[PDB]
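STRUCTURE REQUEST FORM
Protein name: gsnqnnf
Source organism: synthetic construct
Requested output: structure tokens
Priority: standard
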Amino acid sequence: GSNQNNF
Ligand SMILES: [Zn+2]
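Status: completed
Returned output:
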């Protein structure tokens, strides 16, 4: 799957 981190 794809992963996104938005700090
Ligand atoms: Zn993955």
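Reviewer notes: The pocket of zinc ion is lined by residues 1 (CB under 6 Å). DSSP finds no helices and no strands in the chain.
Form closed.
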